[PDB]
């Protein structure tokens, strides 16, 4: 599985039949159809105690991993019940500014999308949580090209150190708070992992407000490689999945 012509998303169903299931992700968010749900509580993002450990190129993206052994960086409230702990964050991006996001808003595509992955602490570990319908909560953040995002520069400067698949680098004292938009207004819907095994265990929380990054910052993303060191160079670009059928599900809005 990958994002090329021969292993791309249109092929994923052969090894992961769930790819054509009922609650697949990402999806187009139709703002005129989304239902404002007054019963929706404000998101509760507590990341002041976050502990980042490292960053790695897994051959389809780069992940910034976090120590999830204690309630240090947690998400609650919103449509959620209980506590979800931050385990990692990664991005999806394009070859040009016109594409790259997973979710789309009224069919508009962003230059990239940020996913903050969190797992429900009642299930005791990540691997158990993926087996549950309310097992994960993912915070989606859209990225538009404009002004630089100061809080993202620390991520950009280390990309050189992890150019190819399998490389990783110590990455401590990174504060996720520098990646959040001013508003916490969101859309939510039941869905799935955006990559294989594509398990339908996620409560998606997509924020309405995009963060802007500079052309120079996204450029640095486009320099990563899908290949391992010593293999022909395959730039890491367009690592995003096309929108899937909503099939009955309803998208609620907090605003």
Pairing label, strands 43-46, 62-66: unpaired
Given a contact cutoff of 8 angstroms between Cβ atoms, the answer to whether 90 and 64 are in contact is yes
Of 241, 242, 224, whose CA–CA distance to 233 is shortest?
224
Between CA 125 and CA 11 the distance in angstroms is 30
Site for Zn ion in 30-69 (CB under 5 A): none
Closest separation between CB of residue 90 and Zn ion, Å?
6
Of 45, 36, 133, whose CA–CA distance to 84 is shortest?
45
Please tell me the total number of residues recorded for the chain in this structure: 255
Closest separation between CB of residue 106 and Zn ion, Å?
21
Please say which residue, 194 or 224, places its beta carbon nearer to Zn ion: 194
Sign of CA dihedral 16, 22, 24, 28: positive
Does the active-site annotation cover 13? no
- Per-residue x/- track, 144-183, Zn ion (CB under 5 A): ----------------------------------------
Taking CB under 5 A as the rule, does residue 115 contact Zn ion? yes
- Breaks in the chain (C to N > 2.5 A) come right after none
Of 5, 22, 4, 6, whose CA–CA distance to 198 is shortest?
22
Please say which residue, 159 or 202, places its beta carbon nearer to Zn ion: 202
Taking CB under 5 A as the rule, does residue 118 contact Zn ion? no
Please say which residue, 16 or 230, places its beta carbon nearer to Zn ion: 16
One of 11, 13, 32, 60 is an active-site residue; which one? 60
Site for Zn ion in 185-204 (CB under 5 A): 194
- Per-residue x/- track, 72-111, Zn ion (CB under 5 A): ----------------------------------------
3-state secondary structure of 168: strand
Please say which residue, 45 or 136, places its beta carbon nearer to Zn ion: 136
Residues that bind Zn ion (CB under 5 A): 115, 194
* Residues with active-site annotation: 60
């Amino acid at each position: 599985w990958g994002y090329g012509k021969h292993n791309g998303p249109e092929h994923w169903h052969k090894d992961f039949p769930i790819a054509k299931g009922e609650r697949q992700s990402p999806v187009d968010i139709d703002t005129h159809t989304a239902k404002y749900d007054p019963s929706l509580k404000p998101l509760s993002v507590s990341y002041d105690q976050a502990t980042s450990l490292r960053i790695l190129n897994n051959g389809h993206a780069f992940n910034v991993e976090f120590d999830d052994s204690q309630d240090k960086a947690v998400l609650k409230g919103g449509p959620l019940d209980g506590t979800y702990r931050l385990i990692q964050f990664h991005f999806h991006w394009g070859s040009l500014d016109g594409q790259g996001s997973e979710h789309t808003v009224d069919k508009k595509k962003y230059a990239a999308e940020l996913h903050l992955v969190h797992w429900n602490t009642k299930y005791g570990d990540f691997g158990k949580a993926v087996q549950q319908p309310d097992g994960l909560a993912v915070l989606g953040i859209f990225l538009k090209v404009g002004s630089a995002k100061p809080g993202l520069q620390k991520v950009v400067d280390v990309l050189d150190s992890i150019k190819t698949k399998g490389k990783s680098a110590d990455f401590t004292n990174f504060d996720p708070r520098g990646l959040l938009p001013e508003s916490l207004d969101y859309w939510t819907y039941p869905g799935s992992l955006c990559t294989p095994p594509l398990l339908e265990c996620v409560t998606w929380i997509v924020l309405k407000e995009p963060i802007s990054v500079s052309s120079e910052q996204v450029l640095k993303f486009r320099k990563l490689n899908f290949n391992g060191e010593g293999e022909p160079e395959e730039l890491m670009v367009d690592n995003w999945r096309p929108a899937q059928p909503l099939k009955n599900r309803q998208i609620k809005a907090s605003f």
